Every structure is written in structure tokens, then in C-alpha cells.
Amino acid sequence: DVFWKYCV
Amino acid sequence: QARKLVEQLKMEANIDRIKVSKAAADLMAYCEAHAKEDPLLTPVPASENPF
Amino acid sequence: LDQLRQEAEQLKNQIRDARKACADATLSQITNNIDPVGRIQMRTRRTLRGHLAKIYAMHWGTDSRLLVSASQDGKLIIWDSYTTNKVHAIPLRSSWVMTCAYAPSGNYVACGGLDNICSIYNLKTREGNVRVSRELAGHTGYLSCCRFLDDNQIVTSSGDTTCALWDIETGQQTTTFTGHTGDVMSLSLAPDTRLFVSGACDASAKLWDVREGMCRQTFTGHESDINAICFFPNGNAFATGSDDATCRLFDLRADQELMTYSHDNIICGITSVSFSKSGRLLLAGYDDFNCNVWDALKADRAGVLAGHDNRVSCLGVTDDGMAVATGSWDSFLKIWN
Amino acid sequence: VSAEDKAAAERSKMIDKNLREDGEKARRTLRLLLLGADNSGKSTIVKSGIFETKFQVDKVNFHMFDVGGQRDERRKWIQCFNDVTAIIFVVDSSDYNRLQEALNDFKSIWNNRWLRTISVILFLNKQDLLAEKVLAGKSKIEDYFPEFARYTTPEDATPEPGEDPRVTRAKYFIRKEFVDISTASGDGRHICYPHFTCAVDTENARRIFNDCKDIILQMNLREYNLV
Amino acid sequence: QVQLQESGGGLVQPGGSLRLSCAASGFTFSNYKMNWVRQAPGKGLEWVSDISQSGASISYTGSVKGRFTISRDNAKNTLYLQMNSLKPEDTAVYYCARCPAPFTRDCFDVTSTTYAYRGQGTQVTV
Amino acid sequence: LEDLVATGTIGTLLSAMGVVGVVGNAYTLVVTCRSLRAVASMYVYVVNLALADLLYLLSIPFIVATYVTKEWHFGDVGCRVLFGLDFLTMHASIFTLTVMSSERYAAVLRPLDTVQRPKGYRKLLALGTWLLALLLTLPVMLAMRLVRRGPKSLCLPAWGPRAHRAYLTLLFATSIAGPGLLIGLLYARLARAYRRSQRALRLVLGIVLLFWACFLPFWLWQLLAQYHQAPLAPRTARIVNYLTTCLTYGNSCANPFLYTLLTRNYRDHL
Ligand SMILES: C[C@H](CCC(=O)NCC(=O)O)[C@H]1CC[C@H]2[C@@H]3[C@H](O)C[C@@H]4C[C@H](O)CC[C@]4(C)[C@H]3CC[C@]12C
Ligand SMILES: C[C@H](CCC(=O)NCC(=O)O)[C@H]1CC[C@H]2[C@@H]3[C@H](O)C[C@@H]4C[C@H](O)CC[C@]4(C)[C@H]3CC[C@]12C
Incomplete structure (x- = not known):
């Protein structure tokens, strides 16, 4: 999307 | 000044000593006799120990 | 002057010859067959803290429960070892204190230091207050060690290279022990209480009789000034610690050194010396922030106390020997058993 | 659970509270040790057997202890001043003789293990007498100190009132002796604060206050893990 | 008994040289820093020379600098002081003294009244 | 593939930093509590820091646990716990x-x-x-x-019509910008006072503490505060995000070394 430190 | 020192030395010289072996034996005998009573040398039961 | 010097030299030579002649063997050889004591891994049962400055003295009472400790903050605290609760905290007129004492009956306590005055405090009295009973004055140097012969007599040592015996009621010295050429920095009463021994800054120790008032024997001593001294429980011997980083044992009858406790690792002088109930474990404090236990007969390091971040100052075992206490400059007093 | 242990606990709590309050009250004052020779004029710098002075500057209290009752042997009782904030060491700069004794005493104080962490404040007293002696020229500092003949005045240094070059040179040589003694074994734990003063000088208290402030700042730097 | 026995000294004409040697007994010589003390008639004790444990560090007094030499022999447990260009003012009793504590940089009471760790000294008159 | 080389290097750097920082934080926590109590009166605060950057580094295993910055995420519990932590x-x-x-x-x-x-x-x-x-x-x-x-594993935590952006801006103002400026001013005045009142290396550490601990590692926000509008492609976005993320953990690792290990107290205890 991305959202904060985690990325998918 | 020096008269007092030499008098003290003369008084100290006039003393009767014992051999080292006898003193060592006396110390060893005292240590052996009082070894069991000593809690530091031989640890005492925890229940008896106030600390 | 020349004749007196020659006579003194001749007497010293004769005394040295007699001392060397009367020597069967070393103490180590006789005690070789003795079984080693073993690793003495003492544990800090309790810590008292509370003090705010360096603790300079400590002395167990006869009751084996109450121990009095003086600090250079101006406080004299009477701790109860079992419950670690304070009983009496006496403020001090002079903030500089170097010695403390506890009466055998437990009624009185004594303190002294740079003020050159041996202050006495009465604990058990009407109205339930701690007040100065008598102040002893007359010393020209700093008070270093005071002990109670009884409830009415105190033996003190000063930096005036002198010791004194006092009558509390009279307030005046009844006997003056002179002869030392250095600051007498320790004083341990004998169990018989009719004799005592004092080590001075001149690297020597002297035995004294309270009634006679004259020195009985003088020992060669260490290579440096003596900081601590203690009396063997038997009463015919005494230990001595000095800044030479070595401990020594002397016998009154032998009139010579018996055993030397030293190690190549330690280069720090002694500050406090005490003997266990049986006399088998000689506990000493070193200025490298720890304490060492030695075997009196075997002359070996049985264990180490450690646990102090600063130089230790006072060491003492209780009469029944059930515990030991160490007070250091950390302002923490640790009881080991 | 019995009344005895409860009373003992209450006594312990009250005594601990009193001790904490007394320590909090006492920790405010800063403790100083006055040390000097008989001829150094130690008594009049700031304006039984141990004398005490207590003065307040900038709403802070300084308590200074001087010892005179001891029998000329300081190797043992000087350890009692292990916790003092500073040692005010006064030295008679006027007397060319006996100055080596002052240097040796300063070195012995500096190299002591129990005084290593303690900082000293140097007071070169009787400055005007030294200036008068230099002006007269009857006594030569070269005789007592042969290294003074080759000592040139520092280039960056400059006196405030514009003193005579001989006086400035002598003063800087005297101060350099003490600072060279200090820097040899200072190792950063403690640092000397040399000063010049006279018997009529009045701002000694302010100098002492500033030096104590600097010492406490260094202590806070070492204590607050600021290196 | 930490005895210190001095040897040497006596009447010396001005400009002369003399060696004063003190032997030691009762203590380990190498551990202790050694010092010399002078006492002139009508004058107090004064430090005149110092030598460390290993003999590397060495210090003199400004008055005697360039004319006095201090030497330390650990093997023989002795301390020597060579004296060159002896001045008339340099007439005094010399005491060869020991630092109070071993393995110690500081020496407080080397020059003091009734100090135990010093010898009887020898008198040098010029 | 060549496109995954950057992600692999980022992951290895993050793992190495996590290990180093965890070791440093644990050593600082044990040393300060066990030994450095009487000295270093600041120790309690230090302990707090030693705790904080510990738990923060626990996020490093989870970040690299996202199937090498791709594919699978733990789920509701993982995202919910990790964000709050x-x-x-x-x-x-x-x-x-x-x-x-x-x-x-x-x-x-x-x-x-x-x-x-x-x-x-x-x-x-x-x-x-x-x-x-x-x-x-x-x-x-x-x-x-x-x-x-959309993405079957990406949590989309926007409780409101993109009002989370305002809360992120508020957190930026109150957490990184505010304390950052406070630390900057305080350390600048401390350095000025020390230089004026003394020295007539410590200031190097003072400046490093400010610049590193507050500004350069804390540059992840400069990306995320662009939640308003900013052009990006997914390949570039993932790389930029994982590059910016590692700096915060680098600061977490740098804190114990600057605050405890390099000080004179630990040198004495060594
Ligand atoms: C290197 C990190 C752990 C970082 C750390 O600080 N660990 C402390 C510890 O192991 O005690 C671990 C935790 C999560 C793991 C990852 C996840 O399990 C996801 C993934 C699984 C793949 O099969 C291999 C790569 C990959 C990406 C793993 C690489 C290694 C990882 C094992
Ligand atoms: C992570 C960095 C930003 C770091 C920063 O601004 N400050 C770090 C600091 O100094 O602390 C970003 C900024 C520009 C980015 C690059 C540019 O977008 C150009 C380029 C685009 C490619 O698609 C991917 C690589 C590549 C080369 C990008 C990699 C990540 C970069 C280098």
C-alpha cells in the first residue's frame, strides 16, 4: 500500500 | 633520656622464655580443644544459627 | 652519651642473641601434620547500611546482639544484629571520630577521635535519654583506640605516642603508659584484663601491665607502621597487622615472632585484625576493598569476604563467635556468617 | 508480632527518619581542609585542638577545618579528610628559604592515595613581601633555585596592573614549580588551582567559591557519565 | 628493627668531596623509596635528596643540585651520597631515612621530629 | 534476482544491527544494575533506556519475518501488538x-x-x-x-477517513520534533557552558548524541508524514521504507554505547 515499517 | 631507655632494655632482658615448640604445642592444643565450639570453623545447623 | 649508647647496643645484642637461641623450629614444621581448614566461603547474612559517611570503628557487645558503630558524619549507631533495627543514634560533638567501644556490662559506650577527648555516653539511665556522662581530656594527640576494662576504667591510646588508664568517676589519668616513639594506633585488652598490648607507628608492639604501669616486653614488629592488633583467645599470643601488607603472630612467653601471613599478590596494608573463638581463623581487613581469612597454624588463605567497594576499617567477631562484622568506608556494615 | 518488636520497629523508623533529615541538612555545606606551614599565615586567608571556620558566599555555606593539635606527624590522621571537597594549601611565597619544604609537602599531599581524588587550591601568600624582596635585590632566587636563571617569562602571560618584569618572572617561576609538581601525577582525577594573595586581600572567599564550583562541575561531569 | 646505620662524615676542607653510605637491616630495601635529610646547627630538618625504588626517578634540592649524587644498591641494601665541591654552609648532620610505607609514591614525615624510620646520622663539618 | 539483492542486504544489515544492539543493551542493563549503582546517579534513567531499546529491537525479527519483505504477514494479532509495542x-x-x-x-x-x-x-x-x-x-x-x-496480509489501520494522518503528524510534533529540538538546545547550551567555564571529546559525544539519536535515524517519519501525497512505485517504495526503518534500530544500538560503555565508570569497572 504501504503501511508503517511492515511492507506488503 | 638514654638512661630510661637503657633501664627499660635491662628490665626487658631479664625475662625467662620458653622454647618455640612448647608455645606451638600449646596453641595447637587450644585450637583442637576449642575447634568444635567454634561455629565459624565448623558450620552450625541453620536452625540454631540466628543469622 | 657514648656510654649509654654502648650499653643499649650491648643489651640489644644480648636480647637478639637470646631470642635467636630460643628457637626450636618454625611454626609451620610443627603444624605440617595439621589438616587444612578448608575453603571458608562465608556469606553476607545481613547488611545494615544507614550510615552516611565512612564507618571508622565497630565493637560487638557482650550480649552478642548489639554492636556500636561510629562514623565520621558525627553519628554513633547502636545496631541490633538479629533484626537490623537501630536502637540509639547518638550525635557527636566532634564529627571526626576514629575509635569506638562498648562496655562489658552494656551500660556505657565510648567514642574518640581528632578531638583528643574520650567521650563517654550512658545508655541505660533514667528518663530514657543518651547523654555524655564524663569527658576525658589530657591527651596531646588524636585518640585512636579505647577499650573498657570495666564500667569504671578505660584504657585509651593517643597519637602522643602514649596510652592512658582512666578512672571515670575521678576524671583523671591514674596510669600513663609511655615509651613508644610512634603513634600508638591500636590497643587490645587481654582476656585476663590485667594486661594489654599496643602497637605503635614505629613498627613495634609493647605489652603493658595496668597495675605496674611499665612496659613488660617489646617486640621487633613489622617493616612498617602497625595499624591493627588483636589478642589471641588463649591470652598467651596476639596478632598484628601493618602497612607492610603482612600479618604476624607473637607469643608473650616466646618473646619473638611465631608466624607470618603474607602473599605476593597483596601489596596493601592491614587495617583491622580479629581472632575467631577457637583462634583457628584469623580475619584481617585489607585496604584493597576486601578481607581475608587466614589459618593461624597453617598460614594459608582459607577464604575471602569481599563485597566492599571501599577500604574496610573495622573487623570484629562476637564473643560466642556466631558471626563476624565488617565496617568499611562504603558506609555499609556487613555481617558475615 | 509482639509489642516489643513493634516498638523496636517504630524506634528504628524514627531513628532512620532523623538520620536521613540530618544527612540532608548536612550535605548542603561544602567541607574544606586548611593546610599550611606556621609562617604561611594560614589563619588570615579567609578572614579542642582543631579550629573551625564557617562562611557563607552566594547563599552557600563553606565549613573549613584546620588542625594544629597533632604532633607533627600527618601520615595517619590526614586520612580522616578523605571526603573533603578541597584542600586549601597555603604557602609563604615571600621566603625563598623553606620553599623546598613547601614543595615537598605539596608533592606528598598530591601523591597520597587517600588524597588523590581530592583537589587542592593553592594560595601563594605574602605576595607583596616577595615583590618587595625582588625589588630590593638583596636576596637572589637563583641561589636557592638555580633553574630560575634560565627561566624566561611566558609570552602569552600578562599581569593586570603591569607589574615589574622581575616580579612577574619570579611569580610565574614560583607558580610553575607547583603546577609542574601537580601535572606530573594529576592524571586528570584532580587539578590544582594556583592563586596569588596578600594579607590585605579580601576576595579570597570568592576565589575559593569559584574553585569549589569548578571542582563540583568536574565531579558532576565524572558522575553523570559525561566523561 | 628497620635499623639504618650511617658511615662516613667528618671534618672536610672547603671544596672537598666525601661519600656517606647508609646500610639497612630488617626491611626489604627495594620496596621503599629512600631519602636524605640535613640538619645544620641552629637549623631544622630539611629534605636534600630522594631516590625511588628502582633508582630511575631522582630529585635534589636546588641548593645542592649539581654537586650531590645519590646512588642506591638493592643488592647490598645500601644508599650512598657522594658530595662534591663542599661549601662551608654545608656543615650538618645527615640522616638517611626511609619512606614510611612500601610501594608508596608519597613520603610525608621524612623530615620531622622523633621520626622512627631514620638513622642516627653522621656529622659533616666544613 | 538482482532486484532482491537490495532487500537481502537490508535484511542482513537489520539482523546484524539487532544482534549487536540486543547484546549491548543486555550488557548495559546487567552492568548498571550489578555494579554501577553508587556511582553514575543517572543509572536509573539509563536502566529505562536499556529496557526501551531492548524491546524496540524485538521488532527487528518480526520485520524480517515478513517473508523477506514480501508475501505473508502474521495477521491481526501480530500487527495489533507490534504497532503498539x-x-x-x-x-x-x-x-x-x-x-x-x-x-x-x-x-x-x-x-x-x-x-x-x-x-x-x-x-x-x-x-x-x-x-x-x-x-x-x-x-x-x-x-x-x-x-x-487487496493485499491479503497487509493490515490497513486507518480508524477514520484518513484521520490517522493527523495523529501521525501530532506524534511527529510531540515525539521526534519537540524532544529533538529540546535535546538540541539543551546540549548546545551545555556545550557552550562547558567550553566557557573549562578547558582554559566530551563535546564530540554531546554533538553525536544530538545529531544521531534525534535526527538522522529519525528520518523514517519524513517518508510517512508524506501520507498526504507523494509519487512512488512499489519496488522503490519497499526499498526506501526498509532503508529508512533500519536507521531507528541503529540509533537504538548506538544509545547504550554512547551512554554507558564509553564512559569512564565502565572503563574503571573493566
Ligand atoms: C534473523 C531473524 C532473527 C533476528 C534476531 O535478532 N534473532 C534473535 C534470536 O534468534 O534469538 C530470524 C527471525 C525470523 C526469521 C525469518 C522468518 O522466519 C521468515 C523467513 C523464513 C524463510 O524460510 C527464511 C527467511 C526468513 C526471512 C527468516 C530469516 C531468519 C529470521 C530467522
Ligand atoms: C533511503 C534513501 C533516503 C535516505 C535519506 O534521505 N537520508 C538518510 C540519512 O542521511 O540519514 C533514498 C532516497 C532516494 C532513494 C533512491 C532514489 O529514489 C533513486 C533510486 C530509485 C530506484 O527505483 C531504487 C534505488 C534508488 C537509488 C533509491 C534508493 C533509496 C534512496 C537512496
Whole structure:
């Protein structure tokens, strides 16, 4: 999307 | 000044000593006799120990 | 002057010859067959803290429960070892204190230091207050060690290279022990209480009789000034610690050194010396922030106390020997058993 | 659970509270040790057997202890001043003789293990007498100190009132002796604060206050893990 | 008994040289820093020379600098002081003294009244 | 493939930093508590920091656990716990740094007063730090509205019509920008006072603490505060995000070395 430190 | 020192030395010289072996034996005998009573040398039961 | 010097030299030579002649063997050889004591891994049962400055003295009472400790903050605290609760905290007129004492009956306590005055405090009295009973004055140097012969007599040592015996009621010295050429920095009463021994800054120790008032024997001593001294429980011997980083044992009858406790690792002088109930474990404090236990007969390091971040100052075992206490400059007093 | 242990606990709590309050009250004052020779004029710098002075500057209290009752042997009782904030060491700069004794005493104080962490404040007293002696020229500092003949005045240094070059040179040589003694074994734990003063000088208290402030700042730097 | 026995000294004409040697007994010589003390008639004790444990560090007094030499022999447990260009003012009793504590940089009471760790000294008159 | 080389290097750097920082934080925590108690009166605050950057580094295994910055995420519980943990720990660490810097400034500027002041407040302040962190992390921790759609594993935590952007801006103002400026001013004044009142390496550490601990590692926000509008492609976005993320953990690793290990107290204890 991305959202904060985690990325998918 | 020096008269007092030499008098003290003369008084100290006039003393009767014992051999080292006898003193060592006396110390060893005292240590052996009082070894069991000593809690530091031989640890005492925890229940008896106030600390 | 020349004749007196020659006579003194001749007497010293004769005394040295007699001392060397009367020597069967070393103490180590006789005690070789003795079984080693073993690793003495003492544990800090309790810590008292509370003090705010360096603790300079400590002395167990006869009751084996109450121990009095003086600090250079101006406080004299009477701790109860079992419950670690304070009983009496006496403020001090002079903030500089170097010695403390506890009466055998437990009624009185004594303190002294740079003020050159041996202050006495009465604990058990009407109205339930701690007040100065008598102040002893007359010393020209700093008070270093005071002990109670009884409830009415105190033996003190000063930096005036002198010791004194006092009558509390009279307030005046009844006997003056002179002869030392250095600051007498320790004083341990004998169990018989009719004799005592004092080590001075001149690297020597002297035995004294309270009634006679004259020195009985003088020992060669260490290579440096003596900081601590203690009396063997038997009463015919005494230990001595000095800044030479070595401990020594002397016998009154032998009139010579018996055993030397030293190690190549330690280069720090002694500050406090005490003997266990049986006399088998000689506990000493070193200025490298720890304490060492030695075997009196075997002359070996049985264990180490450690646990102090600063130089230790006072060491003492209780009469029944059930515990030991160490007070250091950390302002923490640790009881080991 | 019995009344005895409860009373003992209450006594312990009250005594601990009193001790904490007394320590909090006492920790405010800063403790100083006055040390000097008989001829150094130690008594009049700031304006039984141990004398005490207590003065307040900038709403802070300084308590200074001087010892005179001891029998000329300081190797043992000087350890009692292990916790003092500073040692005010006064030295008679006027007397060319006996100055080596002052240097040796300063070195012995500096190299002591129990005084290593303690900082000293140097007071070169009787400055005007030294200036008068230099002006007269009857006594030569070269005789007592042969290294003074080759000592040139520092280039960056400059006196405030514009003193005579001989006086400035002598003063800087005297101060350099003490600072060279200090820097040899200072190792950063403690640092000397040399000063010049006279018997009529009045701002000694302010100098002492500033030096104590600097010492406490260094202590806070070492204590607050600021290196 | 930490005895210190001095040897040497006596009447010396001005400009002369003399060696004063003190032997030691009762203590380990190498551990202790050694010092010399002078006492002139009508004058107090004064430090005149110092030598460390290993003999590397060495210090003199400004008055005697360039004319006095201090030497330390650990093997023989002795301390020597060579004296060159002896001045008339340099007439005094010399005491060869020991630092109070071993393995110690500081020496407080080397020059003091009734100090135990010093010898009887020898008198040098010029 | 060549496109995954950057992600692999980022992951290896993150793992190495995590290991080094965890080791350093554990060693600092054990050393300060066991030995450095009487000295280093700041120790309690240090302990807080030693705790904070510990838990923060626990996020490093989870970040690389996202199938090598791709594919699979843990789920509702993972995202919900990790977001709250990260926010709370970051706020606690930054506030601990601010309090420690303020105490250093008070000590340097007012040496007599700090020595002549009771130290019973510190513990309270320490707890307050975490409490403040809670006040900043509680709305976020509950705001996670789970994975919704599109990417089958990406949680889309926007409780409101993109109002989370305003809360992120508020957190940027109150957590990194505010304390960052406070630390900057306090350390600048401390350095000026020390230089004026002395020296007539410590200031190097003072400047490094400011610049690193507050500004350069804390540049992840400069990306995320662009939630308003910013052009990006997914390949570039993932790389930029994982590059910016590692800097915060680098700061977490740098804190114990600058605060405890390099000081003279630990050198003496060594
Ligand atoms: C290196 C990190 C752990 C970092 C750390 O600080 N660990 C402390 C510890 O192991 O005690 C671990 C945790 C998560 C793991 C990852 C996840 O399990 C996801 C993934 C699984 C793949 O099969 C291999 C790569 C990959 C990406 C793993 C690489 C290694 C990882 C094992
Ligand atoms: C992570 C960095 C930003 C770091 C920063 O601004 N400050 C770090 C600091 O100094 O602390 C970003 C900024 C520009 C980015 C690059 C540019 O977008 C150009 C380029 C685009 C490619 O698609 C991917 C690589 C590449 C080369 C990008 C990699 C990540 C970069 C280098």
C-alpha cells in the first residue's frame, strides 16, 4: 500500500 | 633520656622464655580443644544459627 | 652519651642473641601434620547500611546482639544484629571520630577521635535519654583506640605516642603508659584484663601491665607502621597487622615472632585484625576493598569476604563467635556468617 | 508480632527518619581542609585542638577545618579528610628559604592515595613581601633555585596592573614549580588551582567559591557519565 | 628493627668531596623509596635528596643540585651520597631515612621530629 | 534476482544491527544494575533506556519475518501488538533521552544545586516517561482495524477517513520534533557552558548524541508524514521504507554505547 515499517 | 631507655632494655632482658615448640604445642592444643565450639570453623545447623 | 649508647647496643645484642637461641623450629614444621581448614566461603547474612559517611570503628557487645558503630558524619549507631533495627543514634560533638567501644556490662559506650577527648555516653539511665556522662581530656594527640576494662576504667591510646588508664568517676589519668616513639594506633585488652598490648607507628608492639604501669616486653614488629592488633583467645599470643601488607603472630612467653601471613599478590596494608573463638581463623581487613581469612597454624588463605567497594576499617567477631562484622568506608556494615 | 518488636520497629523508623533529615541538612555545606606551614599565615586567608571556620558566599555555606593539635606527624590522621571537597594549601611565597619544604609537602599531599581524588587550591601568600624582596635585590632566587636563571617569562602571560618584569618572572617561576609538581601525577582525577594573595586581600572567599564550583562541575561531569 | 646505620662524615676542607653510605637491616630495601635529610646547627630538618625504588626517578634540592649524587644498591641494601665541591654552609648532620610505607609514591614525615624510620646520622663539618 | 539483492542486504544489515544492539543493551542493563549503582546517579534513567531499546529491537525479527519483505504477514494479532509495542517503546526511549539530557544540562549549568538537591524524584519521572508513552500509543494500539482486502496480509489501520494522518503528524510534533529540538538546545547550551567555564571529546559525544539519536535515524517519519501525497512505485517504495526503518534500530544500538560503555565508570569497572 504501504503501511508503517511492515511492507506488503 | 638514654638512661630510661637503657633501664627499660635491662628490665626487658631479664625475662625467662620458653622454647618455640612448647608455645606451638600449646596453641595447637587450644585450637583442637576449642575447634568444635567454634561455629565459624565448623558450620552450625541453620536452625540454631540466628543469622 | 657514648656510654649509654654502648650499653643499649650491648643489651640489644644480648636480647637478639637470646631470642635467636630460643628457637626450636618454625611454626609451620610443627603444624605440617595439621589438616587444612578448608575453603571458608562465608556469606553476607545481613547488611545494615544507614550510615552516611565512612564507618571508622565497630565493637560487638557482650550480649552478642548489639554492636556500636561510629562514623565520621558525627553519628554513633547502636545496631541490633538479629533484626537490623537501630536502637540509639547518638550525635557527636566532634564529627571526626576514629575509635569506638562498648562496655562489658552494656551500660556505657565510648567514642574518640581528632578531638583528643574520650567521650563517654550512658545508655541505660533514667528518663530514657543518651547523654555524655564524663569527658576525658589530657591527651596531646588524636585518640585512636579505647577499650573498657570495666564500667569504671578505660584504657585509651593517643597519637602522643602514649596510652592512658582512666578512672571515670575521678576524671583523671591514674596510669600513663609511655615509651613508644610512634603513634600508638591500636590497643587490645587481654582476656585476663590485667594486661594489654599496643602497637605503635614505629613498627613495634609493647605489652603493658595496668597495675605496674611499665612496659613488660617489646617486640621487633613489622617493616612498617602497625595499624591493627588483636589478642589471641588463649591470652598467651596476639596478632598484628601493618602497612607492610603482612600479618604476624607473637607469643608473650616466646618473646619473638611465631608466624607470618603474607602473599605476593597483596601489596596493601592491614587495617583491622580479629581472632575467631577457637583462634583457628584469623580475619584481617585489607585496604584493597576486601578481607581475608587466614589459618593461624597453617598460614594459608582459607577464604575471602569481599563485597566492599571501599577500604574496610573495622573487623570484629562476637564473643560466642556466631558471626563476624565488617565496617568499611562504603558506609555499609556487613555481617558475615 | 509482639509489642516489643513493634516498638523496636517504630524506634528504628524514627531513628532512620532523623538520620536521613540530618544527612540532608548536612550535605548542603561544602567541607574544606586548611593546610599550611606556621609562617604561611594560614589563619588570615579567609578572614579542642582543631579550629573551625564557617562562611557563607552566594547563599552557600563553606565549613573549613584546620588542625594544629597533632604532633607533627600527618601520615595517619590526614586520612580522616578523605571526603573533603578541597584542600586549601597555603604557602609563604615571600621566603625563598623553606620553599623546598613547601614543595615537598605539596608533592606528598598530591601523591597520597587517600588524597588523590581530592583537589587542592593553592594560595601563594605574602605576595607583596616577595615583590618587595625582588625589588630590593638583596636576596637572589637563583641561589636557592638555580633553574630560575634560565627561566624566561611566558609570552602569552600578562599581569593586570603591569607589574615589574622581575616580579612577574619570579611569580610565574614560583607558580610553575607547583603546577609542574601537580601535572606530573594529576592524571586528570584532580587539578590544582594556583592563586596569588596578600594579607590585605579580601576576595579570597570568592576565589575559593569559584574553585569549589569548578571542582563540583568536574565531579558532576565524572558522575553523570559525561566523561 | 628497620635499623639504618650511617658511615662516613667528618671534618672536610672547603671544596672537598666525601661519600656517606647508609646500610639497612630488617626491611626489604627495594620496596621503599629512600631519602636524605640535613640538619645544620641552629637549623631544622630539611629534605636534600630522594631516590625511588628502582633508582630511575631522582630529585635534589636546588641548593645542592649539581654537586650531590645519590646512588642506591638493592643488592647490598645500601644508599650512598657522594658530595662534591663542599661549601662551608654545608656543615650538618645527615640522616638517611626511609619512606614510611612500601610501594608508596608519597613520603610525608621524612623530615620531622622523633621520626622512627631514620638513622642516627653522621656529622659533616666544613 | 538482482532486484532482491537490495532487500537481502537490508535484511542482513537489520539482523546484524539487532544482534549487536540486543547484546549491548543486555550488557548495559546487567552492568548498571550489578555494579554501577553508587556511582553514575543517572543509572536509573539509563536502566529505562536499556529496557526501551531492548524491546524496540524485538521488532527487528518480526520485520524480517515478513517473508523477506514480501508475501505473508502474521495477521491481526501480530500487527495489533507490534504497532503498539513500537510506538510505546519509541516514545519511552525518546522521553528517557530528553530527561537524561535535561539532567545533564542542569548538572553542568548548576553544579552546586544538583549536588545540593534530593534525588528521590528520578524514579517517579522514569515511570512517568512510560505513562506519557502510553498516552501517545493507546489510540494507535486500538486503531488497528485488521487486514481488510487487496493485499491479503497487509493490515490497513486507518480508524477514520484518513484521520490517522493527523495523529501521525501530532506524534511527529510531540515525539521526534519537540524532544529533538529540546535535546538540541539543551546540549548546545551545555556545550557552550562547558567550553566557557573549562578547558582554559566530551563535546564530540554531546554533538553525536544530538545529531544521531534525534535526527538522522529519525528520518523514517519524513517518508510517512508524506501520507498526504507523494509519487512512488512499489519496488522503490519497499526499498526506501526498509532503508529508512533500519536507521531507528541503529540509533537504538548506538544509545547504550554512547551512554554507558564509553564512559569512564565502565572503563574503571573493566
Ligand atoms: C534473523 C531473524 C532473527 C533476528 C534476531 O535478532 N534473532 C534473535 C534470536 O534468534 O534469538 C530470524 C527471525 C525470523 C526469521 C525469518 C522468518 O522466519 C521468515 C523467513 C523464513 C524463510 O524460510 C527464511 C527467511 C526468513 C526471512 C527468516 C530469516 C531468519 C529470521 C530467522
Ligand atoms: C533511503 C534513501 C533516503 C535516505 C535519506 O534521505 N537520508 C538518510 C540519512 O542521511 O540519514 C533514498 C532516497 C532516494 C532513494 C533512491 C532514489 O529514489 C533513486 C533510486 C530509485 C530506484 O527505483 C531504487 C534505488 C534508488 C537509488 C533509491 C534508493 C533509496 C534512496 C537512496
